[PDB]
Subunit: 189 residues, 4 copies
């Protein structure tokens, strides 16, 4: 939308551009994924609509050559107080195995640490998703506990991760640029 | 969106087209309203209605187009529709588009959709007692009185008129020519 | 509870006493209803209503006592009361206590509390069309017809008649002596 | 209530009795806390937890009694318990009642309930880094480190240590004798 400055945020790496999904990018994302189409829109709509200073979720479309290939989300409750963010992500099947996962994580963590002035970033992976765990290792996260949840009716264990600003800085390798954030700054605090 | 059949629904009258608001229509609708927090408030509300559709609890905000331009919104909603067969409506129309009878026509459009396509038995609406435009729309569309209510509006008491229109009353007295296109693929979502 | 002044409220009529249900009274109300999920569902609903009390959104589920036995519930509730000055009521009465004039006495009890203690200007109620006893109680107490609503009830459509009672209509029709105790300490909670 | 079997559950240790708070016990717990909005805030919170019980999402706030006096609450919670077999706990103890070893004993009580009766596989807890007592309870009860969090607490950032205890570790190292009465009837309430 042209009535919401978060739509003008761009985060760019040498290979990727991240931005809030417009109608066109959402439909590209659904093609990438392909009840699922509506569930995907519904979820993105609800995240966009629920943005508040003290409870926000930014689902960023990840673009390779201008094409949406997945989503890298950043979120936080009580950010102005905790200075802690959490992330989640998915990447289309045919785009996995090319290091986009690591690069797109790098991109949101730069945004978090350099623009939002976060002090900690968290993530989690199912223990049977080594690719996502490898992304966390590469970005310098430290193990931060075990959790058990219901995943499609069966027990799944999740590994939790913690990345401080200092550890982030020591481990970073990806060049990241942020544009459009000046008008957005008042939304976060 | 190209991945949700409700976006292909079209309701057309002699002067109007109603359809689910796309990204472009939402932004046009916000342009109309602005004729600070209001833009996000508006997107947020539309987004939550689009995302919240459930067979047993839905709201359908339809952008109202006059010669291409989004001039306002005519909504229809219902909780437990398959059981109640009762729908409710609410609406707004940009100030510079008021006084042309678009209000009456847009209400007639969703009533046709509710009765002819959804097979509703009853449609309801409400107006603040000091909204003469909405009250006129209801009278021109042949609704019955259905009660007097009171609510809080901006920290003060506001009285509200309730309206009810039944399917047979509508069948026998309706006068607006309405066409619905793209409903067959939507049909399963409602029943 | 000894920590919430609403528990000290007493409304008394010639044959009835109404009060917020304590633990023992909730359990008697459940005894009454049972003339497997039902006990917990009742408990859960009463707890949630007790817990949800807010000045701008409250529900008062009053146990109705005949000779010490909890026989039914006469509820009063209101959203934005300080602004609207309007209250709503609902009730149920155990099967074997029906047909003895308790329904009208229990409505008179809460109506007096609303108009004389809370200083309400309007009281509303609704009754399903297939509940003529409850309809008659509304007519007996002076309520006027105020619309029709359809809702889902046990997976089937049930039509409700809505009722409206102004303070003047209340006054004109009131016959039952009502006394209210323990309200002074509750006063701040309501406004 | 005499219409909800969870009220007939009793968990006892050498010094303590734990049970779901009746109306009288809620009022004693509030008396203990008071040693303005606080009474109703407490009632409303207990009422909501009592009412919110579902197989797939429950919270069990247990009043802790020392010779009939209500000194605190030891809670046990789980979302999707029948699947995860993981429980979480939280608790408070009246200022007057701290430093007597009740915190460790009350934790031991719910752990035994969780592992011996609910057949939990994992128990978790968290403590603010500036709550040395709660941290010591987790350590005395054999929990291991399970990470670091930050939360907003009264408008300021507060760090919390997370703790995790497995059934095996509990079985090997538990020390407190615990008795649980009134659980048989409650079995179907916790299973699918
Ligand atoms: Sm009729």
């Amino acid at each position: 939308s042209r009535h919401w400055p978060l739509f003008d945020l761009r985060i760019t790496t040498p290979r990727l551009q991240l931005q809030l999904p417009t109608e066109e990018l959402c439909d590209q994302l659904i093609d990438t994924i392909l009840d699922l189409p509506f569930n995907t829109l519904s979820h993105l709509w609800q995240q966009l609509a629920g943005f508040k200073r003290d409870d926000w979720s930014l689902p960023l479309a990840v673009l390779v050559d201008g094409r949406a290939v997945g989503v890298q989300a950043l979120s936080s409750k009580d950010f102005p107080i905790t200075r802690q963010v959490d992330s989640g992500s998915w990447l289309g099947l045919r785009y996995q195995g090319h290091g986009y996962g690591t690069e797109m994580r790098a991109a949101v963590l730069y945004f978090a640490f350099a623009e939002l002035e976060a002090q900690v970033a968290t993530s989690r992976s199912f223990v049977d998703n080594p690719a996502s765990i490898a992304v966390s290792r590469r970005n310098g996260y430290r193990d931060n506990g075990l959790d058990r949840v219901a995943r499609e009716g069966a027990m799944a264990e999740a590994l939790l991760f913690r990345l401080t600003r200092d550890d982030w800085q020591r481990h970073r390798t990806v060049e990241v640029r942020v544009d459009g954030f000046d008008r957005c700054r008042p939304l976060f605090g």
